[PDB]
Design a protein around this nucleic acid. Structure first.
Lengths: 348, 141, 38, 131
RNA sequence: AGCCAGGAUGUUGGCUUAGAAGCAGCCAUCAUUUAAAGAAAGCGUAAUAGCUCACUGGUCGAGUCGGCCUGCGCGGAAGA
């Protein structure tokens, strides 16, 4: 848990403090950033671990020390100090679990898609839109339906939705993946628990900085004679333009009309169109290569979250939580699942 | 009294024994060992108080040791426990951070006169009060 | 050496000479401040 | 350098300090260190305070201009660098011997301690002062 | 204009505690000793340290330093 992670951070702090005084390292800036993280973490760690060790010692020694009353009063004072130290350790964990980075402040795109069992997925994906809308209206987030493909017996097959504000992606990072469904559904007559799955993609903003300059100082413009037919004038004059980019290597050849300025206009518009095509193709490949890594095949396999409905259990594969509610979870209030994953993900 | 050979005035608050992250190789750049700044550094720190940044002379000789006469800590680190607020300048005149009066800085000023150079107590007093005013503090005259 | 058309005294040690009609800016401190016609 | 008013005010202030002055001495810090300033003017602040001017303006028409009104025999101090240092409290105080005692204390040349003129004397090491 | 000197103690100053410390960027751009010193114009350091100029002394000892109106010139001004 966090105690096994804090010890490795304290050992890395004690190693970096010894390596800093050895004076054998030329580069020191990354070592100074590591020492800054060490001064942020290991001081509160050495406070909280020593306070918890002294509290556990003063409790376990005075609990069975021949049933004394003065040792019991000393253990009560140590328990008050233990409550103060536990509040200080919770404040230190809340300070260490803070999203300082400005990439966490960005908006997001949620893509809830159906997996196994279409009818079940539709019921489930519509309820997950309901689940994150309930979650989103609690903190006052804006929910806009960008695209929603309907199912058969209700729900939706694919939902792509923008959520805007201040800090959507940094709070909803850990939701890309699969979701189990164990339910007794409304579409099933028999009444046997079934397994259904749904896949959720979480995408960041990535704001469009499009249309770089054409850079006529970087354009190589070759004005040479044209091939073909038509007149004496074509032979005398060039009437053909080839423009090549230096940083991308895009070549556009125009031999269309008589005047070169109509040809100049086409030989710049095709450059702009091919720049826009080659940049939007790379952007759509960068979207797809991340979506195929976040969204799996869609099967019933374990992908980080398992939800149990007839037993009353919510068990995730990372940070094995055992919350037996399923009623304060179905109507917003997803703090207890999301927060400790952040707390022991920012420990690394 | 020889000239400038190897001495500088830099170390963090003296309550931290052997500060390896903050200063580190800057005290161990010469032939003086790191262990010289943990064992002999607290021979004067324990006399008065621990945790205050106090400069000391680092004139390095070739005889493996160094002589030192401890100086006075500045008013910048002194106006954290005797001023109330732990913050300082950055917005000096755009807003008022805190205020001390003349009767406190004037009383503290002659205690720091062992290292300061002044012909009168009032001159060093108004020097320290101007240095305190430079952090945006408004003296109550 | 710099062969510009407009010359100014860059550092404090620049000196205006009129060698062979060609106005030059010599510098005894830095060799980079020495330059051609002005 | 400033015009006639500032230099004249400085020379008149020097004459007004000589008119309420006492025994003085000489010093020639051709290679002077501020640590030595932090011994002599620290001594000056130790005595009473700020009043003592160590003003080194021994040009042949600046400090010699104030010589025919006070202490004409100091017109021979007109040559090479001499810094005056007067005394407002005390007839023949102990500041005269301190330049000669600090002459061995990192103050290699100190104007050969030729001194100044209470009995109109010459170069003398004089310990006979009222203590 | 040249020449023998100075050109300080806290300023490791609070700052986003990784450091910006007279000199990346913030603002404050204090005050003493004072012949004089801007809490700094430049060089150089991860930051220091260090090197100059600002300015002030002394030898020296007669005129010197910087802007403006114009006339004639200089360069930019390289073809078959």
């Amino acid at each position: 848990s966090i105690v096994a992670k804090l010890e490795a951070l304290h050992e890395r702090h004690e190693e970096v403090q010894a390596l800093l005084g050895d004076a054998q390292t030329i580069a020191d800036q990354e070592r100074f950033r590591a020492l800054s993280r060490e001064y942020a973490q290991l001081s509160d760690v050495s406070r909280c671990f020593t306070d918890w060790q002294q509290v556990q010692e003063d409790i376990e020694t005075a609990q069975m020390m021949l049933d004394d009353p003065e040792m019991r009063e000393m253990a009560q004072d140590e328990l008050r100090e233990a409550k103060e130290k536990s509040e200080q350790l919770e404040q230190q964990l809340q300070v260490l679990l803070l999203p300082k980075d400005p990439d966490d402040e960005r908006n997001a795109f949620l893509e809830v898609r159906a997996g196994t069992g279409g009818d079940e997925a539709a019921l489930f994906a519509g309820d997950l839109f309901r689940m994150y809308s309930r979650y989103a209206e609690a903190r006052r987030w804006r929910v806009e339906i960008m695209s929603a493909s309907e199912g058969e017996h209700g729900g939706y097959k694919e939902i792509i939705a923008k959520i805007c504000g201040d800090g959507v992606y940094g709070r909803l990072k850990f939701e890309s993946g699969g979701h189990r469904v164990q339910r007794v559904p409304a579409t099933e007559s028999q009444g046997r628990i079934h397994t259904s799955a749904c896949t959720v993609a979480v995408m960041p903003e990535l704001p469009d900085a499009e249309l770089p300059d054409i850079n006529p100082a970087d354009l190589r413009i070759d004005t040479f004679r044209s091939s073909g037919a038509g007149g004496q004038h074509v032979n005398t004059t060039d009437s053909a333009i080839r423009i090549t980019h230096l940083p991308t290597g895009i070549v556009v050849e125009c031999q269309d009309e008589r005047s070169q300025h109509k040809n100049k206009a086409k030989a710049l518009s095709v450059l702009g169109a091919r720049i826009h095509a080659a940049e939007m193709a790379k952007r759509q490949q960068a979207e797809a290569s991340t979506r195929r890594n976040l969204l799996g095949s869609g099967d019933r396999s374990d992908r980080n979250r398992t939800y149990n409905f007839p037993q009353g259990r919510v068990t995730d594969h990372r940070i094995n939580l055992t919350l037996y509610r399923l009623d304060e979870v179905m109507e917003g209030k997803l703090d207890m699942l999301i927060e400790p994953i952040i707390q022991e993900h920012q420990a690394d | 009294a020889k000239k400038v050979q190897a001495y500088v005035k830099l170390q963090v608050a003296a309550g931290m024994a052997n500060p390896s992250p903050p200063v580190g190789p800057a005290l161990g750049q010469q032939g003086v060992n790191i262990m010289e700044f943990c064992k002999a550094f607290n021979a004067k720190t324990d006399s008065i108080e621990k945790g205050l940044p106090i400069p000391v002379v680092i004139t390095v000789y070739a005889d493996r040791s160094f002589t030192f006469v401890t100086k006075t800590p500045p008013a910048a680190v002194l106006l954290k426990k005797a001023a109330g607020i732990k913050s300082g300048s950055g917005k000096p005149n755009k807003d008022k951070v805190g205020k001390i009066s003349r009767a406190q800085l004037q009383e503290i000023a002659q205690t720091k006169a062992a290292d300061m150079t002044g012909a009168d107590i009032e001159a060093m007093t108004r020097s320290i009060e101007g240095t305190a005013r430079s952090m945006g503090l408004v003296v109550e005259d | 050496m710099k062969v510009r058309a407009s010359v100014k005294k860059l550092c404090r040690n620049c000196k205006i000479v009129k060698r062979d009609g060609v106005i030059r800016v010599i510098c005894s401190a830095e060799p980079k401040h020495k330059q051609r016609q002005g | 350098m400033a015009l006639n008013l500032q230099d004249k005010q400085a020379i008149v202030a020097e004459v007004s300090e000589v008119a309420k002055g006492a025994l003085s001495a000489v010093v020639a810090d051709s290679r002077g260190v501020t640590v030595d300033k932090m011994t002599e003017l620290r001594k000056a602040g130790r005595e009473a305070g700020v009043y003592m001017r160590v003003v080194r303006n021994t040009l042949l028409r600046r400090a010699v201009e104030g010589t025919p009104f006070e202490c004409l025999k100091d017109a021979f101090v007109g040559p090479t660098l001499i810094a005056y240092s007067m005394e407002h409290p005390g007839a023949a105080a102990r500041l005269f011997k301190e330049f000669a005692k600090a002459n061995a204390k990192f103050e290699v040349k100190a104007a050969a301690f030729e001194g100044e003129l209470i009995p109109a004397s010459q170069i003398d090491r004089l310990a006979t002062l009222p203590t």
